[PDB]
């Protein structure tokens, strides 16, 4: 079946949106080619090592017990951003435990157990975000509205933050910070005695998502010791939202009819992670790879394996393909061996070493600098809600490029405007922070460690990834960034105190 079926009216905006300041940001006018891509039949054939793999899975979610939230928790855990409801109540309401949005939230929830069946209205917009230099679309949102929304989370939450660990294990790739990510993918690749490995990508995932998928997953969380009524909601939720429903515009207006994964749901993660990691285990079995090792975050994968040798890894990538394809989910780009870790890319991003200050190889996250250079320069302009550039240098900040560029940059901006002891919201980890610039090198040394000060003596590779990235974009060079954090670092020492901190800390690198 149609992953979509759309009416012809426009995915429009709910707000001004601005497409430039090169650095460009996605908006509704690109939505129709989008929903070209993300639209078609998808073809999908199980076999044995799917149904095999779905068993052991099952078995592993029969032990794990889950609660229901009460409609008390769910608001305390909605995020103060989130879209308003359409039925006079937002966000900040729920939070605060409002008569208007309680009583609304238990009317959706008794409607969720006494009607199993009727699909549930979502609304669709397009994405507002930032990329460099042809251009891409925007991608979809798909929600509901937020009381249903919380009433997932009633259902849900405790399911969804418990039962994927469990399930997948070391395979989870949402339980680790960077360096735990890094900690499992050097520790798995070193304990094969001819490491190769593979990152795999699915070309709209979302859309490859069927509803048979969607059930598979609905009977692996009923495989959860649930309470009668918390089954019952999950179903619904199933039936209602998750397999599919209607869409309708900002403007209140039908665009068409969805039959594949919301990208919006409690469930999108976790079910994208599930689903993923179901598909992925079966082909492994199908192309015969030996010791196979997952990390799953949504639809990126990365499998680590003992090689066969180049020809017979080559092939066993293409009938890994062939199954993933059987399964529903082909690839943006056909998937590579790689014998060196370094070249591995998920999430955008990619292991690399350096040296901590006693000599020692340290392991970091590093990543391909563009895109965070170019958030980060939009954001000098505009402003946002995400502060993009600072989430990169908590998330990056033992890498040189978040080092030598972002920080230098940002605290160069905080001293020129004396902002430096004001909070800036910023989206880390699915959640919203309120952060105190003063705050980051011990945010920093709890995230990383104190070696995140200290690492020297960086891969060739990655220094020329950084000076390509500088030049292409017509940034300063690496030495001008030394040069203005000296200029940084003896300012914030001047000012004392948790300035003088920042200095010491983040700016340890640009001293003689
Ligand atoms: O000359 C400088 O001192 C400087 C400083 C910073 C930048 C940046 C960003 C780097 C990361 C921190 C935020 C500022 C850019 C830049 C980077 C990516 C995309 C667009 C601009 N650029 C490039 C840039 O703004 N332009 C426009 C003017 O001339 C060449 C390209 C920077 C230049
Ligand atoms: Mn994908
Ligand atoms: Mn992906």
Known sequence: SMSYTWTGALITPCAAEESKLMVYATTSRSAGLRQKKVTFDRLQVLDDHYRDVLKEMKAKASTVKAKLLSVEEACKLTPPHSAKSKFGYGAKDVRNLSSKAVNHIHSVWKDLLEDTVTPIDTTIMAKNEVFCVGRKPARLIVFPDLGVRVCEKMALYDVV????????????????????????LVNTWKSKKNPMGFSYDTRCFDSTVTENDIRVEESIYQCCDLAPEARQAIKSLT????????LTNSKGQNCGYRRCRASGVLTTSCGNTLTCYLK??????????????????????????????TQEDAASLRVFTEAMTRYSAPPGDPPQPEYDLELITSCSSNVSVAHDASGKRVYYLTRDPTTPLARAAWETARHTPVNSWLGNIIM???????????????????????QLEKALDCQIYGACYSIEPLDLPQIIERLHGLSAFSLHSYSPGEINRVASCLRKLGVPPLRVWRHRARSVRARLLSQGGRAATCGKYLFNWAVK
């Open 280 to 309: 992925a285990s079966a082909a492994c079995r199908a192309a015969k790879l030996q010791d196979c090792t997952m990390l799953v975050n949504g639809d990126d994968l990365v499998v680590i394996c003992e090689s066969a040798g």
């Open 396 to 418: 990056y900040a033992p890498t040189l490029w978040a080092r030598m560029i972002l920080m230098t940059h940002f605290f160069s901006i905080l001293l020129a405007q004396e």
């Open 161 to 184: 933050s418990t039962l994927p660990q469990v399930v997948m294990g070391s395979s989870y790739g949402f339980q680790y910070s960077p360096g735990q990510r890094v900690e499992f």
């Open 239 to 246: 039936e209602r939202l998750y397999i599919g429903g209607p």
